[PDB]
């Protein structure tokens, strides 16, 4: 029942040094945890960077160093490169079992930051004719590729019938994603204003429409 947590997402320019950490909720992380680091890349491509706490797997650049800092395992990139943008996962071993951290999303800034283009479409009268109402929120052209989506109706927030696709890479190396709000037609005609808000880099973009 041991939870390993990593930093959600971290940002860094090329040439900089950055440290990903890996916290254990059993207590301090020791070499007896044989902290491994594995990297995931688009199209689910995994590379095992570090095993045995600080042992680099062959061929892996010097750039990457496993380390214990304080009470936590740590992966450090010294002279971070643009190709290091990835999810990084640490894994710790515990009395026969492994547990994975939830993974840090690393952004090595390949280009200036970029705010999403948000677009909120209302339901079509065709869907409506089937007693359904889907609002579609399209989010494109953002960098770093990390957002969270929220929906509001007549002021109050929603936690029912929401779905957001994981941000995927556009061909200009920015990211895109979509988010959906499925409701009854009944419900759609019972409310007035519907809102889609993407948070990104400590600010929020919000499209909303009022019902005609």
């Amino acid at each position: 029942q041991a939870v390993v947590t990593q930093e959600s997402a971290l940002t860094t320019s090329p040439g900089e040094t950055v440290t990903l950490t890996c916290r254990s909720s059993t207590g301090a992380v020791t070499t007896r945890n044989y902290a491994n680091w594995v990297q995931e890349k688009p199209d689910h491509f995994f590379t095992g960077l570090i095993g045995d706490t600080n042992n680099r797997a062959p061929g892996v650049p010097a750039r990457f160093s496993g380390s214990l800092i304080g009470h936590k395992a740590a992966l450090t990139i010294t002279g971070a490169q643009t190709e290091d943008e990835s999810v990084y996962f640490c894994a710790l071993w515990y009395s026969n079992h492994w547990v994975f951290g939830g993974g840090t999303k690393l952004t090595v800034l390949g280009q200036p930051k970029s705010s999403p283009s948000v677009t909120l479409f209302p339901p079509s009268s065709e869907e409506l004719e089937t007693n359904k109402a889907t609002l579609v929120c399209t989010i494109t052209d953002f960098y770093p590729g990390v957002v969270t989506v929220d929906w509001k109706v007549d002021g109050t927030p929603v936690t029912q019938g929401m779905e957001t696709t994981q941000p995927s890479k556009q061909s200009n190396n920015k990211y895109m994603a979509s988010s959906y709000l499925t409701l009854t037609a009944g419900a759609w005609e019972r409310h007035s204003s519907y809102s889609c808000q993407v948070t990104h880099e400590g600010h929020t973009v919000e499209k909303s429409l009022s019902r005609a």
Partner: protein, 217 residues
């Protein structure tokens, strides 16, 4: 050289089971631990368990204590995972991955199979319903919603491929056993509606085609 071969994808019925396979090559199957890892859409990796094909020693996560069974056939260098009594919860990608010669010490998760997208669904080949998305109002972003189809994928184009740049087509979502995606395109304000814009959706699996002109609401 070192290679892990998992079948691309598998469709399973809500209640049934599946025996995922992972075929080793490039080294000695009996000398490295295989591990099985679950990953969902944008979620962490979840470690299921591991098997030493030289020993059959197997360790499982509590979570998966009654879900998975690891097995090997050393004469065909294949590790198997058996998943029992499936629900949408189990819809995920599953990877086998190669550990170390040793329990935890002198190695890496250095090599991984392509993964198998296991999809739990009771659906039959269902063609899509396509809906136009016009705005409620510089430039203007139209789209269309491809809803309630199965299986993956569909192909969306705009004006039969005539409009190409400004096209974004997002990943499907699996809702109530059925797939949904949406496509958008951005065109100049004045162009539309004066000139027509039409998504052409097509479903290979049902051999169905739906063209849909977007008109102002």
């Amino acid at each position: 050289q070192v290679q892990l071969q998992q079948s691309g994808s598998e469709l399973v019925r809500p209640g049934a089971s599946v025996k995922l396979s992972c075929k080793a090559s490039g080294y000695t199957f009996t000398t490295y631990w295989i591990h099985w890892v679950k990953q969902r859409p944008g979620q962490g990796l979840e470690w299921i368990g591991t098997i030493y094909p030289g020993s059959d020693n197997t360790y499982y996560d509590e979570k998966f204590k009654n879900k998975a069974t690891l097995t090997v056939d050393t004469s065909s260098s294949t590790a198997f995972m058996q998943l029992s009594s499936l629900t949408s919860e189990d819809s995920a990608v599953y990877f086998c991955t190669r550990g170390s010669l040793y329990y935890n010490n002198y190695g890496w998760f250095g090599y991984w199979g392509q993964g198998t997208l296991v999809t739990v669904s009771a659906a039959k080949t269902t063609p899509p319903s396509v809906y136009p998305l016009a705005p409620g109002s510089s430039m203007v972003t139209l789209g269309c919603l491809v809803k309630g189809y199965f299986p993956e994928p569909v192909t969306v184009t705009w004006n039969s491929g005539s409009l190409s740049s400004g096209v974004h087509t997002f990943p499907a979502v699996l809702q109530s056993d059925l797939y949904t995606l949406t496509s958008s395109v951005t065109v100049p304000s004045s162009t539309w509606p004066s000139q027509t814009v039409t998504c052409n959706v097509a479903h290979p699996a049902s051999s169905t085609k739906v063209d849909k002109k977007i008109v102002p609401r």
